Design a protein around this nucleic acid. Structure first.
Lengths: 67, 68, 67, 67, 69, 66
RNA sequence: AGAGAGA
């Protein structure tokens, strides 16, 4: 499953990611964890729990390895 | 389940949390309770029942410790 | 279930509630009934059937006691 | 079930209804049919298949008697 | 059987011109060439578009349709 | 299943498929992967994981056999 | 709460 490999990779490598939300608002930071419904992001020291239903797009700084 | 540990934590510690909503609005308060579809928040003494579908982000006042 | 308690209490007590919609429009009235997907609100005697998917928040006039 | 009861009443009574969509757009007409995902609205004799996921609110001209 | 399927199959069969309005109020016109549970394959001047049903608000035909109700 | 046939032909013929999001924002690229919930688009060498629930429309460059 | 898409 592409979604979970992608999120695990950005997590295990501490890649910076911009997370665009459905409404265009944006967050940047690193992925600390995720489950079926949410992604736990950290931006400059602070946790943000984001619902996946509210996410449009993860644009990572560096590109991920996946199959 | 990170979601429920998070919410159950900020509920147990009475942490303050900014709820950001998809409609652009952001709300600060304390979590009184939640189920699978909704979060009960209190913002200055007033209840608000908020649908999870309408929420984008929670930003706690102080980071929550979780098992991941 | 928190949602069902809340809605049934504001229904039983005829509590006025503000409903904030996903589009930021704001409705005010009293809940006359609900099922899994919808809420029946009366505003100045006029019925509205609202899909819960279009609601963001209910803010009661007085706080509900919940178990 | 409030939803079915409401939609079946306004259908069989031919009640004029404003349908407000998620974006605030308002369509006015009579419901001629519905199923699990859609509602068939007739406006000035034009058929519109509307997805329930796009609907916010039905506001009938006259109140609908329900159980 | 269900109203959505008859409606989409009818306009597809007749190559009816249709406005599709999307959740954000954008509108496309075209003919339906097919659909499945999740998507509608519209053609607006020769040009294929795969539209998710979740992004669609309303199908409005210019020309009224036959439905078993 | 039209969806899966389409995403696949734009993916194998590495088509410039443009992607309109619910908020109207648009991105061009080629599809490298998809699952039930998500699309992996490369745009300008950069990877982007897009949730399907956020996508409005894929508009290809050349049309697809289905 | 009245509908043409680069966050």
């Amino acid at each position: 499953n592409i979604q979970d490999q992608f999120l695990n990779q950005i997590r295990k490598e501490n890649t910076y990611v911009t997370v665009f939300l459905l409404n265009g608002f944006q967050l940047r930071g690193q992925v600390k964890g995720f489950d079926n419904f949410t992604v736990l992001l950290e931006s400059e020291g602070k946790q943000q729990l984001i619902y996946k239903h509210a996410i449009s797009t993860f644009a990572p700084q560096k590109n991920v390895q996946l199959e």
